[PDB]
């Protein structure tokens, strides 16, 4: 099994988008060969709230697109900023909800223990990200964040 506890503090997220994001992350969990039951939470917030969360939890007084908090396997929490995701979606040329899904996938891989702070880690983690997105059908280069 795989359950996402979703929350949307903005009222912007459509019900169809929750399903699209959950289906992508469930596919990723299977591609990662995680057989156990897993659970996680995804919360959508506006730019004022993401800055406050970034300030108090990361000592970064600034807006950002996604924050992941790593801890049935309980994987932790992903927080996504709708304001930033909408602008990044415009810059990459896919929809708001596609960008929400990409940021959720990125956070999910972080919760599994991947990181990209070194070149070797980045190659491993973006290699998995690209492979999952391609296997799901998201093969256009900018759906990978050109990455
Ligand atoms: Zn990251």
Numbering used by the authors: 1 to 71, 86 to 161
Pull verbatim passages from the article behind this deposition:
Early studies revealed that YbeY was involved in late-stage 70S ribosome quality control and the maturation of the 3' terminus of the 16S rRNA in bacteria. A later study revealed that Zn2+ is required for the nuclease activity of YbeY.
The SaYbeY structure consists of a four-stranded β-sheet and five α-helices. The active site cleft was identified between the protruding α5 and α2 from the flat surface of α3. The second citrate ion is bound by the carboxylic groups of the Asp65 side chain and the three histidine residues: His130 in the loop (α4-α5) and the two histidines in the hexahistidine tag. In the modeled structure, the single-stranded RNA was located in the active site cleft between α2 and α5, and a phosphate backbone connecting nucleotides 3 and 4 was located near Zn2+ at the active site of SaYbeY.
